[PDB]
Amino acid sequence: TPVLEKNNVTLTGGGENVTKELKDKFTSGDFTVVIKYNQSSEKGLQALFGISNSKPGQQNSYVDVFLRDNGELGMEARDTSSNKNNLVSRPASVWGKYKQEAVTNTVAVVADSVKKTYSLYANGTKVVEKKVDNFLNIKDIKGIDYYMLGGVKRAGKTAFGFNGTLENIKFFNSALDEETVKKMTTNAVTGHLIYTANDTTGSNYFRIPVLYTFSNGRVFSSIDARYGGTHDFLNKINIATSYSDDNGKTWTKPKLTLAFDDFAPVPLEWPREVGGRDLQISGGATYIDSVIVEKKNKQVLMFADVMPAGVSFREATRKDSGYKQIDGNYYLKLRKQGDTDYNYTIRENGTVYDDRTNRPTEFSVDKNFGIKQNGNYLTVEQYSVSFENKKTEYRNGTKVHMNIFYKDALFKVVPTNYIAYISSNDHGESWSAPTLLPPIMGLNRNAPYLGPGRGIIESSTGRILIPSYTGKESAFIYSDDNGASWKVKVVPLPSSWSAEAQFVELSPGVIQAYMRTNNGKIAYLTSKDAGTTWSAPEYLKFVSNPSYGTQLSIINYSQLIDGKKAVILSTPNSTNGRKHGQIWIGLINDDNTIDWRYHHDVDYSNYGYSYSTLTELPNHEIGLMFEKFDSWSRNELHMKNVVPYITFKIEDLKKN
């Protein structure tokens, strides 16, 4: 039961006094406030409400909940005389606008005196809970005399004035429990998540969404389910998938499609504070950065990077592919426990050979990288993770198959990165066992790193193209035999670009690779022979990003726009961070230049926008999934429920 409920309060910075209605209602001093609002302007710091001592000198005696122009939700509780100042917040908590309309959000704050915590909720997620030593409730702050909607009265003046409509606001004079407030804050925004914290995947975190529309009208998604927070590395990451047969309206419960079981797919509460956020899961085999393509025969391919347990992308050797060539064939090498050298290879039928004697052993490696001895699986104990802000990785008593990618294996692969792929003949419902890519970069180089998103089938040749990169070169992985065998075109770049790329076809035989650079710009290279040879890079003139850059998404679109063949591009566009997401429409001219005629700002310019993926829906609308946060910032690590799915008509995308 609310002590006060108000509704449809429209404000333009000036606030509304509710002192009469609330003074003396908070007898314990605890509170819960639930606010459903939309903003008419996002600029500045804006308080949804404010409870204060308004007198001269008591400016630092107040409680509020606030929004920032970047989507951060926070609260303060401050007392002037005792000089105590609490601030609790989480980045990337709310939405601003969506297709020209202010987004309705629902947030809440819970101040619990017994356990000395402030909790904040936004759109069904408890975005933060913090225990504080200097806890303050309404009665702890001396001389509270003013209760206000849409600001805080400080020294007789409205501060932090809110611009928007408080659609509904409820004040409660007790700390309401977690599940009740989650439910109260659930709304239409909550529904835009395909993957949610601790869903079927067992993961609390996701990054690197990929969308793809199959030829039968199924809309497919894949994502990194990152268990040990959002770290690229070290981590325990699986690839999860989910699909829609109704144009993206409803989605299957996620499946784990590429996963190792040296660690279980269980939810971990990863620390976000400065002293814990650098912590990593260190002992766990990983799939990361997925790429999808549909072949002409309707078979689907998914590629991902593979990292053995404990192997850092930074530290890992770049001068060993992990393969040995024997009588013209390439076989994966292994080192047995107790040996310094790699004396063994995986040859026909997974049989492990001792290369010194050239004889098969009693050991074999199955199609899922599991080790057998005389037909029986070897096992190891699985690891769990425990926190007590020290983290422990410990053996949990469950036996799993010993695997060549695991820390505790009898036979191990070379500690480097690999690429694996799997195929599906039923539009993504079931998948083959993984195949590791052969040493296409050479025996004495590591595999490339995939550029997440999609691959393409170039139409004139039927060549399958998969984007990847080395750190110094582009590596365009391809097959001219419908995916039976793979080759690579390696293209030196102007600098050390982390060249995450995507392809478009402009006209038959003519393709472009758009990619991330280390110079602030998006580069594109052009091939007029279906990827065999590439021009020097050119740069988009209208995107300006930080030097580190971000992944992009670009797709071909099937319908004419203004009479012309089109492409559609998604990227952040800001020098200040991974922010200011835009979708751009490019119209192909007869000379194969592009007229980049339209752009659309996805939300307000300070709102986070990192890795993204576009797809054309069967109805010819556009689906977008994206990281609605800044995935470079160390302040925005390890956040839950921050990778939404939204959609746009071309008519929406023409606006901005």
Numbering used by the authors: 84 to 471, 473 to 740
Paper text:
NanC is an unusual sialidase in that its primary reaction product is 2-deoxy-2,3-didehydro-N-acetylneuraminic acid (Neu5Ac2en, also known as DANA), a nonspecific hydrolytic sialidase inhibitor. NanC adopts the same overall topology as seen in NanA and NanB, with a CBM (residues 85–271), followed by a catalytic domain (residues 272–740). The catalytic domain adopts the canonical glycoside hydrolase family 33 sialidase, six-bladed β-propeller fold shared by viral, bacterial, and mammalian sialidases.
Protruding from the catalytic domain is an I domain comprised mainly of β-strands (residues 403–498). The absent N-terminal residues include a signal sequence (residues 1–27) that was deleted to aid structural studies and a short region of unknown function (residues 28–84) of which electron density was only observed for residues 83 and 84. The binding site of the CBM is on the same side as the active site of the catalytic domain and the protein face on which they reside displays an overall positive charge. The NanC active site is a narrow constricted cleft, similar to NanB and contrary to NanA. A primary component of this constriction is the hydrophobic stack of Trp-716 and Tyr-632. These residues partially block the active site entrance providing specificity for α2–3-linked substrates as opposed to α2–6.
